[PDB]
């Protein structure tokens, strides 16, 4: 094969109302290889080709398949990163390697996701923003650890080449960004994250750059709700679907359970989703369609809840 270019994926790939998850699972892989050459990843760092895919294709496998929490998912937050690049124009802002390292952490963030709910942290906001929620933060993950071990696989190290000290500004940038989508980790940052938008964004200062990375990282795992409205619906669906996959009923509660949906929806939305997707917005105008988006689907919601 080779690498495809992305604007042979679909001529809409690159727009913010394209929904990665319509993408049949078989030509994800193949899809991220052509969003990391088209961000020039692949030129400029020199990956090796051969290698870059088996990377791919072993953290692939390492998920495992929840109705959620699984590839399709961080397939669909990886490619709204690649949206950021493209419509946000993220280079001005950050550093080859900081976008590089969002990417990754992307792919690699759910690897060891385990659905154990066990926190109140952020169902103190948002009951189903804690279903939502990636774990790391609070109890110990080890999607970083796993990723490494597929880095460490023969044939897979693609980034052999780095230096030293790349190599561990990568892995550090790694780490931290994936512990950030844990979305208790998020509400811990958000008034450093709120004081950020309301000065402006500093290109000159490194805290900024962290706060930012955060930002973006959670901005791409809850992305679905900046699709359509088929979108966050399936998504809801899914959602469910993954906290009841073991138990004697009092098909009956089953109803009455996802009639509750609307309104956790629409705090999920008012409490979580749309702060974050403000904050975007606050930070680079060209959001704005992000944030709007967001709104009209906490309007459906709205609007569907009187079942
Ligand atoms: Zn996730």
Redesign the pocket.
């Known amino acids: 094969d080779g690498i495809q270019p992305v604007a042979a994926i679909d001529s809409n790939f690159a727009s913010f109302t394209y929904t990665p998850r319509s993408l049949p699972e078989d030509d994800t892989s193949m899809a991220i290889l052509s969003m990391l050459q088209d961000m020039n990843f692949i030129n400029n760092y020199k990956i090796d080709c051969p290698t870059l895919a088996r990377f791919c294709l072993m953290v692939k496998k390492g998920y495992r398949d929840p109705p959620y929490?699984n590839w399709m998912?961080?397939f669909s937050?990886s490619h709204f990163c690649y949206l950021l690049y493209k419509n946000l124009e993220l280079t001005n802002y950050l550093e080859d390697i900081e976008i590089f390292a969002l990417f990754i952490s992307c792919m690699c963030?759910?690897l060891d996701?385990r659905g154990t709910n066990n926190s109140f942290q952020v169902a103190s906001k948002s009951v189903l923003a804690a279903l939502?929620?990636?774990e790391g933060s609070v109890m110990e993950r080890h999607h970083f650890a796993q990723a490494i071990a597929i880095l460490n696989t023969h044939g897979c190290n693609i980034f052999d080449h780095f230096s030293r000290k790349d190599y561990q500004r990568m892995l550090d940038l790694m780490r931290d960004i994936i512990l950030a989508?844990d979305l208790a980790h998020h509400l811990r940052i958000f008034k450093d994250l709120q004081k950020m938008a309301e000065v402006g964004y500093d290109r000159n200062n490194k805290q900024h750059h962290r706060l930012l990375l955060c930002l973006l990282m959670t901005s791409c795992?809850l992305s679905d709700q900046t699709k359509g409205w088929k979108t966050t619906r399936k998504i809801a669906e899914l959602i469910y679907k993954e906290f009841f996959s073991l138990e004697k009923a009092m098909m009956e509660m089953m109803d009455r359970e996802k009639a509750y949906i609307p309104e956790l929806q629409i705090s999920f939305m008012e409490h979580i989703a749309m702060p974050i997707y403000k904050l975007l917005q606050d930070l680079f105008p060209k959001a704005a369609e992000l944030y709007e988006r967001v709104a009209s689907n906490r309007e459906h919601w709205t609007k569907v809840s009187h079942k």
């Open positions: 929490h998912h961080a937050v963030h759910d996701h939502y929620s990636s989508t795992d």
